[model samples]
Target: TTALVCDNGSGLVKAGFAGDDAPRAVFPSIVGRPRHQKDSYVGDEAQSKRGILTLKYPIEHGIITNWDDMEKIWHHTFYNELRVAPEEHPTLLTEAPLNPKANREKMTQIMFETFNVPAMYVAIQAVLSLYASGRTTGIVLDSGDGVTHNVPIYEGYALPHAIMRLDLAGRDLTDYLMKILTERGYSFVTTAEREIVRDIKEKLCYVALDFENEMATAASSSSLEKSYELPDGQVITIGNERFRCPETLFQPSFIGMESAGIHETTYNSIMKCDIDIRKDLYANNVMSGGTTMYPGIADRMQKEITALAPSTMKIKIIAPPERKYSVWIGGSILASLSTFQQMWITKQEYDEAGPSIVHRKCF
Candidate 1:
């Protein structure tokens, strides 16, 4: 179909042609404009010059709030990054669950009226993640940079009433690690330094299999303490904070967010579904997004959910190797299907039915 699949995630934008193994362009969903300058840099380029540039994130908590900046990011992806005109190919976009109805129409309008794309489809991220894992009915527990969602999908449809969300995500973990270091007098308070802390989280942060025992071991001895050397010849110490930060996902109260953990959210999400589908949802727990990348995360998730769920029902957490980019991969798979052509909101369709047609066209 020569379609373009763009997963405009909170932390990163994953975009590429449909049917590819992965995205060709993976960059931060951030745009930077130099203070008092009109020229703006988008994605990785913007991230590199974070200093002296006022950075703006078009997506906050997985929803688009700033259309102008988002337009530029989309422009850069089409012209500068992937070098494709929107007119030539059908486009597929991945959206957060419980996305407002108005937002969907707005996206349809933008793609048709502004970019003049021949065809386009905006899909729920969880549904796409479930599809990526080869299931039409399951629970997708996706945690990206900005938000975490446990969405229950049944036979290719999402249950909005049963959707579960946790405000904690990868960005929070980075900030939490920063908070941990600041308390130890190794302050990394600046915006650019926050980037360094994120790097620290990626390298050192791990999910603790046993939080209580790990905390005790971390406190009494320095065995858990690891040193990260900076580019400028400074070595920094990171102790219990490594596990403590990512621990926020399992126990968000650690970060002062009075929200249920991922496991509880998953269990509750399934229970909110019909009793008939609850067993199916429990058996096919699909994992997606980058925040689920910590070591032993799937194991920990399985253990926690197993504890909460009934023994008769099988509780599984599916974390494929490509789960980090599952949403985009799912889009890639769907958009390439020849039979799916009828699903696209073609330009002619938009011309006839207007933007609201997308509401009826795509679920």
Candidate 2:
């Protein structure tokens, strides 16, 4: 069995081996330095520093453009956490679909040349279908740090035309929170205050299934206290902006984007397929991704889709905890499969058939 799998994304690093209850360890794609010293490390560690190890994120949005910093962070994670000697095991890594070919080549070199692995294999989420749902058609709505991608799975392949990518995600939501709070008579305690606000969002925010009712309540200025919370362990005495968050999913313009809400976007993605495929949309309409974990998002989406889709069609959603780990968990499952032997490319494939062969085998 392989000892390494790198499902890279700003939000998750699901590595380790088969039949494990979860990824051996999970790392938020961020690093930091102490607040006191003007910086610190990342995650809970950096969060604890009073003045040092200022937090630094290796990935911005989904891209690791900061290669040097990223390399350092991974060195820390792989050596410190897993403590595996690279020579002991073959590695399986995941990358984004349609990622630039140059980037792919560079990454492969990084693994083989820098990490000095004897052999390696790579894949993208597009072809890892069996790993997740096992020969089923499903639409994975992956909501993470900077963007959301709605990818449709048919048999074991991705229907490219049926895919949709959105620009707004956790970053946008947190920014909106900061804007609304500051605009409505609130002051940030520090530049890092946005981090705390995002924490509150993960802890307290929920979608309003009856969005119109939420809007009504928010419209009544007196109900503001019900929607937002104050830093002082109290609810903010405000209303309209309380609904501002759910608005971004329903009305992307709340975050200054021209895109439609999640419902419309989802419908559009499903409709992009051929008529027969569209008919299969309901059963294939699986929900797996971080955004689905938001309170009321699932039920609200069901209501909206039911109203928008043909009465003859049926829609379904998968309600797994931490919806964000869908792909990572899927990777873990796929990594366990003996059939995956054929799916992975060896160093010979890289030399003989080339990187294109790797992509073909992987996808």
Candidate 3:
């Protein structure tokens, strides 16, 4: 039987069967209720369909906020997108670190009652990133859409108390880029088009090795100018914005936002952990999530982290090709193992013990 793995990210959902290296379907975590149509559209279908629609996001700030819309997104992905009956497959889901007990209970109830799945397993997203990198213990830096978290994993378990978080993440960079473009004489009259801003950020932004020097270079020459044509054939020339936007993450104060950079957060998280494992944490620092894919981010982080680390200690950042799906890949790897069969919370067990069984069995 096939096992389904889903990483429910705030920005997107990565879903597919186990034994695969990557997700079969990756779609936005949103549902669109068209103004003209009576029905709602979920995931890519909503994006593909032509209509004036009001978008509903089920996940916000990396957590499920709207259960009704979330259920619809899940139903669409499982049935319409993948065409896999939930009852036929055991499922593995990834959760945010230190997620509330109430949320876990609700999820367990929904999976069993709504989908009638044979079995289920829930794993912490950070620990799964470490697993995806082929390590049982390390420091994982996950910078997604809404937030960035630094979590220390020890032998497949995440240290919840030591987890560090920041509100500054991918969306912040996108907004900052939008602000920069507006200030530079670019204007988009429409209120929508966040996707366009995000596209420019991904296509043009890069972390600077030396922020001050790079800024000087950008200011001195027009050579860095690159033209980005909008959907309406309007072209905008970008100069210093390429580095300045992403630079906000390295130095939050650059954009007047108060938050520590990823390097500082990682260091602080390691300090909160046991001193004996600090070196191991520093040595095998793993990077995951979409924001971590920023060009030159790993090298920049390595430089910053190494400066603060002890002379004897080394800092190495590992980012795999499927870094954005690292958590799901880990779940896929776990589900493929014969030993993992015992870890699933069977329907029989759930029927007898109820939702509390999830807390006791999964973790």
Local distance difference test, each candidate: 0.90, 0.65, 0.86
In terms of lDDT, the best-performing candidate is 1
Off by over 4 Å in 3: 36-38, 48-51, 189-192
Candidate order by lDDT, decreasing, is: 1, 3, 2
User: How should the candidates be ordered by TM-score, best one leading?
Assistant: 1, 3, 2
Residue 67 of model 3, lDDT score: 86
For model 1, what is the error of residue 77's alpha carbon versus the real structure, in angstroms, after optimal superposition?
0.8
Question: How do all models score by TM-score?
Answer: 0.96, 0.84, 0.96
- Regarding lDDT, does 1 or 3 come out ahead? 1
Residues 174-247 of candidate 1 have per-residue lDDT tens digits of 88889989998887888778888999998988988889999999989999999999766789998889889888
Least well predicted 10-residue stretch by lDDT in candidate 2:
34-43
Which residue pairs in candidate 1 have backbone atoms (N, alpha carbon, C) closer than 3 angstroms, thus clashing? none
Better model by TM-score, 1 or 2? 1
Alpha-carbon shift of residue 48 in model 3 (angstroms): 4.5
Model 2 residue 293 lDDT score: 67
